[PDB]
Design an enzyme around this catalytic site. Sequence first.
Site, PDB file in Angstrom:
ATOM      1  N   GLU A 127      -6.217   6.439   5.823  1.00  0.00           N
ATOM      2  CA  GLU A 127      -7.304   5.596   5.341  1.00  0.00           C
ATOM      3  C   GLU A 127      -7.475   4.408   6.256  1.00  0.00           C
ATOM      4  O   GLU A 127      -8.583   4.030   6.578  1.00  0.00           O
ATOM      5  CB  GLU A 127      -7.043   5.118   3.914  1.00  0.00           C
ATOM      6  CG  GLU A 127      -8.052   4.105   3.369  1.00  0.00           C
ATOM      7  CD  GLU A 127      -7.567   2.671   3.427  1.00  0.00           C
ATOM      8  OE1 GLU A 127      -6.362   2.450   3.568  1.00  0.00           O
ATOM      9  OE2 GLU A 127      -8.390   1.756   3.300  1.00  0.00           O
ATOM     10  N   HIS A 167      -5.515  -5.750  -2.400  1.00  0.00           N
ATOM     11  CA  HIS A 167      -6.835  -5.798  -1.777  1.00  0.00           C
ATOM     12  C   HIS A 167      -7.204  -7.208  -1.309  1.00  0.00           C
ATOM     13  O   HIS A 167      -7.933  -7.379  -0.326  1.00  0.00           O
ATOM     14  CB  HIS A 167      -7.885  -5.180  -2.713  1.00  0.00           C
ATOM     15  CG  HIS A 167      -7.689  -3.706  -2.936  1.00  0.00           C
ATOM     16  ND1 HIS A 167      -8.376  -2.994  -3.897  1.00  0.00           N
ATOM     17  CD2 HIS A 167      -6.879  -2.814  -2.316  1.00  0.00           C
ATOM     18  CE1 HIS A 167      -8.002  -1.726  -3.855  1.00  0.00           C
ATOM     19  NE2 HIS A 167      -7.088  -1.591  -2.907  1.00  0.00           N
ATOM     20  N   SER A 221       7.471  10.516  -2.233  1.00  0.00           N
ATOM     21  CA  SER A 221       6.509  11.598  -2.380  1.00  0.00           C
ATOM     22  C   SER A 221       5.307  11.423  -1.463  1.00  0.00           C
ATOM     23  O   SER A 221       4.562  12.373  -1.229  1.00  0.00           O
ATOM     24  CB  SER A 221       6.038  11.713  -3.828  1.00  0.00           C
ATOM     25  OG  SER A 221       5.421  10.507  -4.251  1.00  0.00           O
ATOM     26  N   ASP A 257       2.424   1.717  -3.441  1.00  0.00           N
ATOM     27  CA  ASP A 257       1.366   2.117  -4.360  1.00  0.00           C
ATOM     28  C   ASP A 257       1.088   3.608  -4.218  1.00  0.00           C
ATOM     29  O   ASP A 257       0.980   4.312  -5.199  1.00  0.00           O
ATOM     30  CB  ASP A 257       0.100   1.289  -4.091  1.00  0.00           C
ATOM     31  CG  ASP A 257      -1.087   1.705  -4.942  1.00  0.00           C
ATOM     32  OD1 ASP A 257      -1.530   0.922  -5.795  1.00  0.00           O
ATOM     33  OD2 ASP A 257      -1.620   2.796  -4.724  1.00  0.00           O
ATOM     34  N   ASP A 307       3.045   5.897  -3.123  1.00  0.00           N
ATOM     35  CA  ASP A 307       4.155   6.651  -3.662  1.00  0.00           C
ATOM     36  C   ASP A 307       3.985   6.871  -5.177  1.00  0.00           C
ATOM     37  O   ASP A 307       4.356   7.920  -5.697  1.00  0.00           O
ATOM     38  CB  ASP A 307       5.464   5.934  -3.353  1.00  0.00           C
ATOM     39  CG  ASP A 307       6.679   6.852  -3.475  1.00  0.00           C
ATOM     40  OD1 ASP A 307       6.952   7.373  -4.584  1.00  0.00           O
ATOM     41  OD2 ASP A 307       7.380   7.027  -2.461  1.00  0.00           O
ATOM     42  N   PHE A 330       7.998   8.404 -10.033  1.00  0.00           N
ATOM     43  CA  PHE A 330       9.252   7.907  -9.478  1.00  0.00           C
ATOM     44  C   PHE A 330       9.035   7.400  -8.073  1.00  0.00           C
ATOM     45  O   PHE A 330       8.240   7.968  -7.335  1.00  0.00           O
ATOM     46  CB  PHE A 330      10.308   9.016  -9.505  1.00  0.00           C
ATOM     47  CG  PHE A 330      10.507   9.597 -10.872  1.00  0.00           C
ATOM     48  CD1 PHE A 330      11.190   8.879 -11.838  1.00  0.00           C
ATOM     49  CD2 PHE A 330       9.976  10.836 -11.206  1.00  0.00           C
ATOM     50  CE1 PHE A 330      11.355   9.378 -13.120  1.00  0.00           C
ATOM     51  CE2 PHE A 330      10.145  11.356 -12.496  1.00  0.00           C
ATOM     52  CZ  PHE A 330      10.826  10.615 -13.451  1.00  0.00           C
ATOM     53  N   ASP A 335      10.056   7.674  -4.904  1.00  0.00           N
ATOM     54  CA  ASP A 335      10.844   8.802  -4.426  1.00  0.00           C
ATOM     55  C   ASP A 335      10.359   9.418  -3.115  1.00  0.00           C
ATOM     56  O   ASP A 335      10.673  10.576  -2.835  1.00  0.00           O
ATOM     57  CB  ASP A 335      10.852   9.882  -5.512  1.00  0.00           C
ATOM     58  CG  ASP A 335       9.483  10.505  -5.730  1.00  0.00           C
ATOM     59  OD1 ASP A 335       8.501  10.034  -5.118  1.00  0.00           O
ATOM     60  OD2 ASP A 335       9.380  11.473  -6.513  1.00  0.00           O
ATOM     61  N   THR A 374       3.994  11.711  -8.042  1.00  0.00           N
ATOM     62  CA  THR A 374       5.158  11.477  -8.899  1.00  0.00           C
ATOM     63  C   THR A 374       5.351   9.991  -9.197  1.00  0.00           C
ATOM     64  O   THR A 374       5.319   9.171  -8.288  1.00  0.00           O
ATOM     65  CB  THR A 374       6.438  12.062  -8.280  1.00  0.00           C
ATOM     66  OG1 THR A 374       6.726  11.384  -7.055  1.00  0.00           O
ATOM     67  CG2 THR A 374       6.270  13.567  -7.993  1.00  0.00           C
ATOM     68  N   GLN A 430       0.831  -1.217   0.000  1.00  0.00           N
ATOM     69  CA  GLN A 430       0.000   0.000   0.000  1.00  0.00           C
ATOM     70  C   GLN A 430       0.865   1.267   0.000  1.00  0.00           C
ATOM     71  O   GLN A 430       0.561   2.225  -0.714  1.00  0.00           O
ATOM     72  CB  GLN A 430      -1.006   0.017   1.162  1.00  0.00           C
ATOM     73  CG  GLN A 430      -2.178   0.998   0.934  1.00  0.00           C
ATOM     74  CD  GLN A 430      -3.150   1.077   2.109  1.00  0.00           C
ATOM     75  OE1 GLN A 430      -2.811   0.730   3.242  1.00  0.00           O
ATOM     76  NE2 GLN A 430      -4.356   1.550   1.845  1.00  0.00           N
TER      77      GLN A 430
HETATM   78  C1  HEM Z   1      -8.605   0.238   3.171  1.00  0.00           C
HETATM   79  C2  HEM Z   1      -7.587  -0.146   2.082  1.00  0.00           C
HETATM   80  C3  HEM Z   1      -6.520  -0.933   2.252  1.00  0.00           C
HETATM   81  C4  HEM Z   1      -6.023  -1.653   3.532  1.00  0.00           C
HETATM   82  C5  HEM Z   1      -6.828  -1.855   4.592  1.00  0.00           C
HETATM   83  C6  HEM Z   1      -5.883  -1.018   0.966  1.00  0.00           C
HETATM   84  C7  HEM Z   1      -4.770  -1.741   0.685  1.00  0.00           C
HETATM   85  C8  HEM Z   1      -4.077  -1.720  -0.500  1.00  0.00           C
HETATM   86  C9  HEM Z   1      -2.904  -2.507  -0.751  1.00  0.00           C
HETATM   87  C10 HEM Z   1      -2.290  -3.483   0.278  1.00  0.00           C
HETATM   88  C11 HEM Z   1      -2.496  -2.250  -1.994  1.00  0.00           C
HETATM   89  C12 HEM Z   1      -1.274  -2.829  -2.749  1.00  0.00           C
HETATM   90  C13 HEM Z   1      -0.438  -3.769  -2.280  1.00  0.00           C
HETATM   91  C14 HEM Z   1      -3.416  -1.280  -2.557  1.00  0.00           C
HETATM   92  C15 HEM Z   1      -3.346  -0.749  -3.828  1.00  0.00           C
HETATM   93  C16 HEM Z   1      -4.176   0.208  -4.364  1.00  0.00           C
HETATM   94  N1  HEM Z   1      -5.357   0.662  -3.805  1.00  0.00           N
HETATM   95 FE1  HEM Z   1      -6.024   0.157  -1.889  1.00  0.00          FE
HETATM   96  N2  HEM Z   1      -6.578  -0.265   0.067  1.00  0.00           N
HETATM   97  C17 HEM Z   1      -7.643   0.294   0.701  1.00  0.00           C
HETATM   98  C18 HEM Z   1      -8.577   1.135   0.112  1.00  0.00           C
HETATM   99  C19 HEM Z   1      -8.542   1.712  -1.148  1.00  0.00           C
HETATM  100  C20 HEM Z   1      -9.501   2.644  -1.748  1.00  0.00           C
HETATM  101  C21 HEM Z   1     -10.786   3.221  -1.105  1.00  0.00           C
HETATM  102  C22 HEM Z   1      -9.084   2.943  -2.974  1.00  0.00           C
HETATM  103  C23 HEM Z   1      -9.768   3.901  -3.987  1.00  0.00           C
HETATM  104  C24 HEM Z   1     -10.742   3.111  -4.855  1.00  0.00           C
HETATM  105  C25 HEM Z   1     -11.273   3.943  -5.999  1.00  0.00           C
HETATM  106  O1  HEM Z   1     -11.040   3.558  -7.174  1.00  0.00           O
HETATM  107  O2  HEM Z   1     -11.954   4.970  -5.753  1.00  0.00           O
HETATM  108  C26 HEM Z   1      -7.863   2.212  -3.197  1.00  0.00           C
HETATM  109  C27 HEM Z   1      -7.123   2.264  -4.343  1.00  0.00           C
HETATM  110  C28 HEM Z   1      -5.940   1.628  -4.587  1.00  0.00           C
HETATM  111  C29 HEM Z   1      -5.128   1.857  -5.759  1.00  0.00           C
HETATM  112  C30 HEM Z   1      -5.328   2.849  -6.924  1.00  0.00           C
HETATM  113  C31 HEM Z   1      -4.623   4.148  -6.495  1.00  0.00           C
HETATM  114  C32 HEM Z   1      -4.652   5.156  -7.610  1.00  0.00           C
HETATM  115  O3  HEM Z   1      -3.772   5.089  -8.511  1.00  0.00           O
HETATM  116  O4  HEM Z   1      -5.554   6.026  -7.598  1.00  0.00           O
HETATM  117  C33 HEM Z   1      -3.957   0.925  -5.604  1.00  0.00           C
HETATM  118  C34 HEM Z   1      -2.818   0.825  -6.632  1.00  0.00           C
HETATM  119  N3  HEM Z   1      -7.551   1.475  -2.078  1.00  0.00           N
HETATM  120  N4  HEM Z   1      -4.374  -0.981  -1.619  1.00  0.00           N
HETATM  121 CA    CA Z   2       6.385   9.056  -6.143  1.00  0.00          CA
END
Ligand code: HEM
Ligand code: CA
EC number: 1.11.1.7
Length: 595
Positions: free
Chosen positions: A258, A351, A190, A108, A110, A186, A188, A184, A105
């Site tokens: 969150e 998830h 952020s 991600d 970052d 990268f 990094d 960003t 998370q």
């Molecule tokens: C609560 C949430 C988490 C933990 C209790 C959780 C966990 C993760 C992990 C472990 C991820 C990767 C290893 C991961 C990736 C991405 N998530 Fe998630 N996440 C929780 C809740 C949310 C919610 C709410 C969203 C937004 C959903 C939407 O589409 O409106 C969410 C998103 C993402 C996401 C996309 C980020 C982006 O680029 O906008 C991951 C790459 N997560 N989460």
């Molecule tokens: Ca970054």
Amino acid sequence: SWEVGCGAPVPLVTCDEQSPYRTITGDCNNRRSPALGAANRALARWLPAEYEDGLAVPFGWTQRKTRNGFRVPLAREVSNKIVGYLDEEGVLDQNRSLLFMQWGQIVDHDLDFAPETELGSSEHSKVQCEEYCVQGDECFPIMFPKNDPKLKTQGKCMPFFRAGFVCPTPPYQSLARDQINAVTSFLDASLVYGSEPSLASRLRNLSSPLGLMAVNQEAWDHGLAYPPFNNVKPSPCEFINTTAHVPCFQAGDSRASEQILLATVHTLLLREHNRLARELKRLNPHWDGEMLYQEARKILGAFIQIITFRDYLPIVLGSEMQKWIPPYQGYNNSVDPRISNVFTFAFRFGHMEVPSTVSRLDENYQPWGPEAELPLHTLFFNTWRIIKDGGIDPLVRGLLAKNSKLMNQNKMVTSELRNKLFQPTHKVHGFDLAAINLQRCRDHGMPGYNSWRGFCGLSQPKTLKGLQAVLKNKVLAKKLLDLYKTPDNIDIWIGGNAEPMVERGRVGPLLACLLGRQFQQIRDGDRFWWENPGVFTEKQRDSLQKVSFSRLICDNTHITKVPLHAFQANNYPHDFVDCSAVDKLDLSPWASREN
Ligand code: HEM
Ligand SMILES: [Ca+2]
Ligand SMILES: *[C@@H]1O[C@H](CO)[C@@H](O[C@@H]2O[C@H](CO)[C@@H](O)[C@H](O)[C@H]2NC(C)=O)[C@H](O)[C@H]1NC(C)=O
Ligand SMILES: *[C@@H]1O[C@H](CO)[C@@H](O)[C@H](O)[C@H]1NC(C)=O
Ligand SMILES: *[C@@H]1O[C@H](CO)[C@@H](O)[C@H](O)[C@H]1NC(C)=O
Ligand SMILES: *[C@@H]1O[C@H](CO)[C@@H](O)[C@H](O)[C@H]1NC(C)=O
Ligand SMILES: [Zn+2]
């Protein structure tokens, strides 16, 4: 194709071109194209977008409009039928700690953030979508199928608002809609320092010339820092407890609060920055605040990179690791370091790694208090459990000693996330992350499962029997074809996650290819990659080589007992050693001689 540089981003960027430090926005990383990888630009399109009108409307928007001759099934119906399960017994990952899920998370956050559109500070649409479930413009509600228990208790839908997109925030009808990455590309840090100059500064402590990040003045963790509160209202962390009135934290990334363990990890990284800046002051008393901040920032960024690429990615990608991310060969300015739209869904594999509960553990790594173990849903936007209930340490111990959830074809996403998700501005613990993911796939114009299979050089099942062979599961494949009438229509998030895991990994072949390619790009195309000759000195690089999440914990909490390999499943006391045995980051090579 279309305008090679579409308008309405920030233009007022001048590249120093000799600065030894990353910008906050990511601009100026690539010298030939300085906007590449910069925040607040379009996510990259590895494949052309796929919308029902070919421009901006998501498949599923118009009821009559099919995809490949078939209606796409409701997101919430796919969630109910395939994603959900009842029995939490036996779902835990025997060989991955809870930290493994949590680091994912962090990484991600970052790399990507595609925020919901704005367009209405005074908005009633905000209420027209939520109250009445009427689809229009940015309002793209997730409708409940018939037979859905939420239909009985929650009305006709879950509200859902379409992601922000580049150029105009109002919709455009000449080229395909492109969603924004607000952070960003990268790797990094952020998520710690911000991706916008405006935030990066508010986060800093510019009262003292010590290059520190500002800390909470209201509350302390037995003499250790918390992030500052975000004092803007309405605040969801205050909402979830009227009586406690503890606000969310304020970090370099807005999602920090969150869930309690994300806030926890953000707290550890903030502490690390201030710790690093203190040691850097000792070694170099002549260094001003800006130098201290930048140099600490740069160390932390290297820390994130190394943990991610040396410890995390090998146990995600397994046997595919080497196939997609070969040993590093230096900086390549021909590589596009931008995060792709599909990656932001691929990385959502996390998830299915999230378990139903979170534990606080005492010094003997035993239940901390009577309510040691809590349901995950009571911990969304919960900062009061940190400040008013024993701080970060009991939670860090749980991160170490408890397991991630194992992805399971029959048990994909815990109901804590599937049925009880809390979203800000929304009032209930009654949302569905899985449905949201699927709706969002469509919002983002994702090509389907087989398009990505082809992209990755993999076979494209066309029949029930082909899909059964690919998934190695007769029942799951039947359910998928019952809902999607062809594997061509299967949304990438569920398709990719349905595949059995590669050897020594935690994702299937499709995801390992999408993730593997992306991480290869963010590393190869980063001019400030920690191992790019010249970024650090060789002596510095030798010191960085020994960073560990075990050491980060020791240095930044009152935990004195840690495992060597923090991401594997570790049991106390056997797999735990005293901090004194753990390699430290030797900052000696950062000593800068004036004479
Ligand atoms: C609560 C949430 C988490 C933990 C209790 C959780 C966990 C993760 C992990 C472990 C991820 C990767 C290893 C991961 C990736 C991405 N998530 Fe998630 N996440 C929780 C809740 C949310 C919610 C709410 C969203 C937004 C959903 C939407 O589409 O409106 C969410 C998103 C993402 C996401 C996309 C980020 C982006 O680029 O906008 C991951 C790459 N997560 N989460
Ligand atoms: Ca970054
Ligand atoms: C909101 O937070 C408050 C404050 O921590 C919680 O109240 C605590 O709960 C138990 C009683 O069950 C006590 O140990 C604490 O001393 C309580 N404090 C106060 C001021 O009452 C409360 O449980 C939380 N409520 C919710 C719904 O999460
Ligand atoms: C700013 O740094 C000074 C000196 O270390 C410290 O006294 C103060 O608490 C810091 N303020 C914040 C908001 O972090
Ligand atoms: C640099 O990247 C480009 C395009 O991605 C690639 O074609 C080339 O092989 C790379 N250079 C090296 C030395 O790998
Ligand atoms: C546990 O995982 C590690 C990698 O994280 C691996 O080296 C080890 O062999 C695994 N143990 C088992 C029993 O599979
Ligand atoms: Zn203490």
